[PDB]
């Protein structure tokens, strides 16, 4: 500001002119040249990474059915835990632009029915997924599945 108002006034009163560059060059090239001399001489990566960094209790892979190589992918899950029994596969669908959103779980009510243990698992599952917050990931849901199975097994015996 101070000591430089005339330059600001000159620049503002000169701007958006077709010959501004020519004027500036012709008025300021020679002294600068003389004083100093010459001038200077499919599947998104996030899903692949999160699958790579999951606990070896899970071996999730692509669904043999449904579409592929798109923004929305489908995965089928299997649980291999020595301390827990076998449960339905609990497949998932991943929408496009997975970060900053949440995946959804495809419920299969008839699969979990006809057994008190399996429907106890299912009601604990519904409770936990209602307890999960927004913007959650798939690893959190898988861990919730494992913990719900463990809690149901503990409650049974």
């Amino acid at each position: 500001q101070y000591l430089c108002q005339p330059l600001l006034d000159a620049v503002l009163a000169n701007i958006r002119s077709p010959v501004f560059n020519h004027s500036l060059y012709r008025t300021f090239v020679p002294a600068m040249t003389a004083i100093h001399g010459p001038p200077i001489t499919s599947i998104p990566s996030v899903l692949q990474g999160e699958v790579a960094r999951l606990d070896p209790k899970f071996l999730v892979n692509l669904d043999p059915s449904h579409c592929s190589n798109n923004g929305t992918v489908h995965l089928i899950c299997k649980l291999d835990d020595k301390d827990l029994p076998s449960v339905p596969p609990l497949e998932l669908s991943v929408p496009a632009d997975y970060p900053a959103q949440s995946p959804l779980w495809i419920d299969r009510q008839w699969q979990y029915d006809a057994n008190p243990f399996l429907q106890s698992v299912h009601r604990c599952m519904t409770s936990r997924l209602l307890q999960l917050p927004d913007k959650h990931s798939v690893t959190a849901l898988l861990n919730t599945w494992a913990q719900s199975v463990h809690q149901a097994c503990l409650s049974a015996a």
């Binding site: 010959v19 560059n21 060059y25 003389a34």
Partner: protein
């Protein structure tokens, strides 16, 4: 030596799928401009309905015109002067494309004709009625008129005297012909008519002109077992439209079918051509079977009164896919064949043929005999030749373009003198006309550049006081282009082209001032000022100014401000030239030339007068001498340097006193800068013989406005225009138009030197 110049291909254009084959077209204009279309079928139909415009000097950048056509484009034609393009396809839609703002990278159309549902099979422009004849025997006649002789055909549809009328004629798939004429304004007159009462399939058609203003149309059904009909057409504009009068001409029948040995072969006709447009006395036919083909020629010479006979027929040919005709107008007289045979001069005796292999043949015109065979190591679908026939362009069944070098010798060794005579005779043809010479530069060897330049220099002289007046710019430009190929003389080009500028800036100033009172009658102001300046050899500038009638050199004090940049450039050039004495330099040629120094000498007295009239327009010298007249100091040294060369053949060397006094000059006058205009970017200086070059799309393996001396920033803001040949860059829309030298700006709207 038949050779390959360079192959151009485009990435991602290939790898098409589910694409049926479609015929293509190609067109070569007077300037080195190529207009074509290529089969792409890449994720859009319109890529197969675009017009590709290519410039041979810069093959890498291509222009695409998105034509609004609904079907496959059939034919493309250029005008007599390559300023407009005619395009037609199926379902009518004949369009006339015009150049936009005189830019070759922008096209727009506002004129067209349409017939609904009928594909067009033939299309042509109307004739202007001027042609020339070239005699190789008189190549040393030392007379431009003696070499290239006028033939005097007659023009078609002459109105209001000897000025022809422009338009086009088209023939559809059926027996239907349409004629369109263009008024001097934007008005267009269109008409349609039926050929004859016999309405049938017309698969092939051709159009030719005859002396007297008549059109010959040839129609072929294509069954090889039916006659080829010929009709005569006259066009007359009876006060409101163009009426067409048609009548029948004798027909012919195909050969190679009465041989009674094996006639089942060759069951279809595939090509019907006229041997040369405006030459309707020779017709070429080409029939083909699934495996082999036959090509024949017929004529209508006088022995019924008129009959068609057989001239030649080849032994056996493969499938024919492309045929191309010469464009050079050979005289074809009996006395010229012997002198064109003893000397290896074959620029107009060749017909180019392509087959379904990688083989391209050059066959003799009068008798169908093969003389040149080329193998590519695929087949060629569309191809064209040049006006000088030094090269041919070809499009294969892929995304590749090829340019092939055709030599007049065709492998036969020759001496230097015959080659020089051939090259100069070919260059004089482009000298008389407005055609370019890129294909001629494709063949000039670096070794014999100096001989060509000097011999062309004496060819320029000893003309009848009128050809020299209108060929100065062309004689300068041709040798400026020639001198850049030889590394021995590569440094002299800046001595030529810059010199050209010195005329222009001097030509617009002597005509810019109009005296308000005449003095010294029967003498132009430029001539009187030049003779006054060359009559007085006074050392300083104040004595000379007295006797030039300073009261007359008065302008409107508005164009004077616009001239400031030119005067500053003149002063900077004077300072640089004077400071170049103490030095093979880009400014060496002006030291030994007297006329240029003299003209630059009187160029400054007038600006001294103007500066004393108005001090703001004077060039801004940065001299470290406030009490010394810098421009008078420059004038003294310029006069001293001028007298040493104004003698008729001086052959003198400057004395040491001049050398030291110009040595002391930079201690007082700073040298700001200079810019060299001939930026080396052409492919002529980069190509090598028997070294094919493969270049891709968009690869192309201190910015100043060269027209008006205006400096731009580090990165320019507004878009500009670039010259093709010289390579100069200039602003597109000039900033000052209400107050500018209209005598200087109007000289570059169409073309640059």
């Amino acid at each position: 030596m038949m050779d390959l110049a360079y192959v151009c291909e485009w990435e991602k254009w290939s790898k098409s799928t589910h694409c049926p084959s479609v015929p293509l077209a190609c067109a070569w204009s007077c300037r080195n401009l190529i207009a074509f279309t290529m089969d792409l079928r890449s994720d859009d139909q319109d890529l197969t309905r675009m017009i590709h415009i290519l410039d041979t000097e810069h093959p890498w950048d291509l222009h695409s015109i998105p034509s609004e056509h609904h079907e496959a484009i059939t034919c493309l034609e250029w005008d007599q002067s390559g300023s407009r393009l005619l395009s037609a396809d199926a379902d009518g839609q004949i369009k006339c494309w015009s150049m936009a703002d005189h830019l070759a990278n922008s096209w727009e159309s506002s004129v067209g004709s349409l017939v609904e549902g009928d594909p067009i099979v033939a299309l042509s422009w109307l004739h202007n009625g001027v042609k020339l004849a070239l005699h190789v025997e008189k190549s040393g006649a030392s007379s431009f008129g003696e070499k290239f002789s006028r033939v005097k055909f007659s023009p078609s549809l002459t109105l209001f005297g000897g000025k022809p009328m422009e338009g086009w004629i088209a023939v559809t798939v059926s027996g239907l012909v349409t004629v369109s004429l263009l008024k001097p304004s934007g008005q267009v007159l269109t008409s349609t008519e039926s050929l004859c009462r016999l309405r049938g399939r017309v698969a092939l058609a051709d159009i030719a002109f005859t002396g007297g203003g008549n059109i010959v149309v040839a129609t072929a059904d294509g069954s090889s077992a039916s006659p080829v009909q010929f009709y005569k057409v006259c066009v007359s504009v009876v006060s409101e439209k163009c009426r067409i009068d048609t009548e029948i001409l004798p027909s012919l029948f195909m050969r190679c079918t009465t041989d009674l040995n094996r006639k089942d072969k060759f069951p279809a006709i595939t090509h019907l051509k006229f041997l040369a447009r405006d030459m309707s006395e020779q017709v070429l036919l080409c029939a083909s079977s699934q495996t082999s083909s036959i090509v024949e020629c017929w004529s209508l010479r006088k022995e019924t009164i008129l009959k068609w006979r057989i001239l030649s027929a080849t032994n056996d040919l493969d499938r024919v896919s492309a045929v191309a005709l010469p464009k050079l107008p050979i005289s074809l007289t009996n006395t010229d064949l012997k002198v064109a045979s003893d000397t290896q001069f074959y620029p107009g005796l060749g017909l180019a043929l392509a087959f379904h292999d990688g083989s391209v043949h050059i066959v003799h015109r009068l008798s169908l005999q093969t003389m040149a065979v080329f193998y590519s190591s695929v087949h060629l679908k569309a191809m064209q030749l040049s006006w000088t026939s030094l090269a041919l362009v070809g499009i294969d069944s892929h995304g590749k373009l090829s340019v092939l070098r055709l030599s007049p010798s065709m492998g036969h060794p020759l001496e230097v003198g015959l080659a020089l005579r051939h090259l100069l005779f070919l260059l004089e043809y482009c000298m008389v006309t407005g055609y370019d010479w890129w294909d001629i530069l494709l063949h000039v060897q670096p070794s014999m550049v100096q001989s060509l330049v000097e011999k062309l220099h004496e060819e320029y002289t000893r003309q009848t006081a009128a050809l020299q007046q209108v060929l100065s710019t062309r004689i300068l430009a041709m040798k400026a282009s020639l001198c850049k190929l030889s590394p021995c003389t590569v440094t002299r080009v800046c001595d030529y082209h810059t010199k050209l500028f010195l005329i222009a800036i001097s030509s617009t100033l002597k005509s810019l001032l109009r005296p308000h009172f005449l003095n010294t009658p029967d003498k132009s102001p430029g001539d009187r000022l030049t003779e006054i300046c060359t009559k007085i050899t006074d050392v300083d500038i104040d004595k000379v100014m007295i006797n030039l009638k300073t009261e007359e050199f008065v302008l409107d004090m508005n164009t004077l401000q616009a001239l400031q940049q030119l005067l500053q450039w003149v002063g900077d050039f004077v300072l640089y030239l004077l400071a170049s004495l103490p030095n093979l330099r880009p400014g060496h040629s002006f030291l030994r030339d007297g006329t240029s120094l003299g003209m630059l000498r009187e160029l400054m007295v007038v600006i001294r007068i103007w500066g004393l009239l108005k001090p703001s327009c004077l060039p801004v010298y940065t001299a470290t001498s406030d009490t010394q007249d810098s421009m008078s100091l420059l004038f003294r040294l310029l006069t001293k340097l001028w007298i040493c060369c104004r003698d008729e053949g001086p052959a003198s060397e400057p004395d040491e006193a001049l050398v030291d006094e110009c040595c002391l000059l930079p201690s007082q006058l700073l040298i700001p800068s200079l810019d060299w205009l001939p930026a080396s970017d052409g492919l002529v200086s980069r190509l090598q013989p028997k070294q094919p070059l493969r270049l891709q799309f968009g690869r192309a393996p201190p910015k100043i406005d060269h027209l008006r001396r205006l400096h731009l920033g580090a990165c320019p803001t507004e878009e500009c225009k670039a010259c093709t040949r010289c390579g100069c860059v200039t602003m597109l829309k000039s900033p000052n138009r209400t107050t500018a030298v209209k005598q200087w700006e109007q000289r570059w709207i169409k073309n640059c030197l």
